[PDB]
Design a protein around this ligand. Structure first.
Ligand code: OLC
Ligand code: OLC
Ligand code: OLC
Ligand code: RET
Ligand code: OLA
Ligand code: OLA
Ligand code: OLA
Ligand code: OLA
Ligand code: CL
Length: 262
């Protein structure tokens, strides 16, 4: 009852559209999990953990979209021509707790294909995960108030975006200082991966703000549409490119399974 979803009745079309976005989301992630599984054999040992983390992200994200889709259909019932709330079982908080695990996985695979290792891998990962967790936690607290205190949503949103800015400055500094280490021509590819990250990750703040500029049932639909665009791009497309870089660098490094697959 702390999220705006609880404030509205939905038409069958709005409800069915939301249910379809979530179920379609589950399908995409599990279908890509198999891709990442099958291509791990074509990735050198040095980079294989990068594709394994993609598998982890797929299942983690797929289970939570699956969970949301079922919570969505348990929470509402078609009564008198509309879908009305029946039980307190749907909430976007589940997305936030899940980012605590999936965002580190997405960051760690980027550092691995950057060829960071040892001391600098450990320290860089620690500061990035610490900052990402401060982004998520302050964001989590803030969205508890999207119904009751929109001013406090904005202030937690401002504290969260400060970690977001610092976190991306670390990522960008590491990519642009290490892109000359990369092989197979992937110095060019990693930069686009960074701009794709910038685009897809920034959609989550927009969805976070929907309650402020569109607190209605159509805003609920839009927010889930934006999560779905962002999920597919920050997890699946991003994963495909990370796996591409991993196999190309494997091939340029003398890994024959990688050379034959390409
Ligand atoms: C009373 C209210 C309390 C407010 C508290 C202030 C808000 C904290 C925000 C930023 C601090 C973190 C910024 C400094 C951390 C930099 C990370 C770093 O040094 O690592 C970079 C390096 O590239 C890796 O190898
Ligand atoms: C509460 C509101 C806070 C206001 C927030 C507005 C300020 C954001 C500014 C820039 C975006 C951050 C960009 C971070 C990623 C790019 C930086 C980078 O890559 O730096 C390269 C390095 O300098 C070369 O080696
Ligand atoms: C609706 C189902 C969606 C499910 C999604 C299924 C995932 C595969 C999709 C596109 C692959 C084309 C992009 C190519 C990715 C490049 C990575 C690479 O290195 O290619 C591996 C090659 O196949 C080794 O022989
Ligand atoms: C599933 C993958 C990712 C990378 C999810 C990323 C989410 C964010 C970058 C969220 C950022 C937020 C900010 C910057 C401030 C408002 C609260 C948010 C947590 C949504
Ligand atoms: C304080 C909370 C965060 C704790 C630190 C988390 C960062 C973990 C550091 C990196 C772990 C990566 C290990 C993978 C090594 C790859 C093996 C290989 O080269 O094949
Ligand atoms: C340890 C990692 C967490 C980093 C900083 C947490 C900041 C405060 C979050 C709690 C808000 C109440
Ligand atoms: C790390 C967290 C950084 C600072 C958080 C400051 C915002 C806390 C104020 C919440 C508003 C309130 O308690 O009434
Ligand atoms: C997620 C990104 C956050 C961006 C920072 C937001 C900056 C704050 C913007 C202007 C604040 C205006 C004050 C509005 C008061 C709202 C309380 C009310 O409803 O009366
Ligand atoms: Cl997730």
């Amino acid at each position: 009852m702390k999220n705006i979803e609880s404030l509205f009745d939905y038409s069958a079309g709005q409800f069915e559209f939301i249910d379809h976005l979530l179920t379609m989301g589950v399908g995409v992630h599990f279908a890509a999990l198999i891709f990442f599984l099958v291509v791990s054999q074509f990735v050198a040992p040095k980079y294989r953990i990068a594709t394994a983390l993609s598998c982890i992200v797929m299942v983690s994200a797929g289970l939570i979209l699956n969970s949301q889709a079922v919570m969505w259909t348990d929470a509402y019932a078609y009564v008198d021509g509309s879908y009305q709330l029946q039980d307190l079982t749907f909430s976007n908080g589940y997305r936030y707790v899940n980012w605590m695990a999936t965002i580190p996985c997405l960051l760690l695979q980027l550092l691995i294909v950057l060829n960071l290792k040892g001391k600098e891998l450990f320290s860089t990962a620690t500061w990035l995960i610490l900052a990402a967790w401060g982004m998520i936690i302050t964001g989590y607290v803030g969205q508890l108030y999207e119904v009751d205190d929109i001013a406090q949503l904005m202030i937690w949103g401002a504290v969260s975006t400060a970690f977001f800015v610092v976190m991306n400055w670390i990522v960008g500094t590491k990519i642009f200082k290490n892109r000359a280490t990369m092989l197979g021509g992937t110095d060019s590819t990693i930069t686009k991966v960074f701009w794709l990250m910038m685009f897809a990750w920034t959609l989550y703040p927009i969805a976070y703000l929907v309650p402020a500029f569109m607190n209605n049932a159509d805003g609920v639909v839009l927010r889930q549409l934006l999560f779905t665009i962002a999920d597919i791009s920050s997890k699946v497309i991003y994963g495909l490119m990370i796996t591409y870089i991993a196999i190309q660098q494997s091939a340029a490094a003398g890994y024959v399974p990688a050379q034959q697959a390409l």
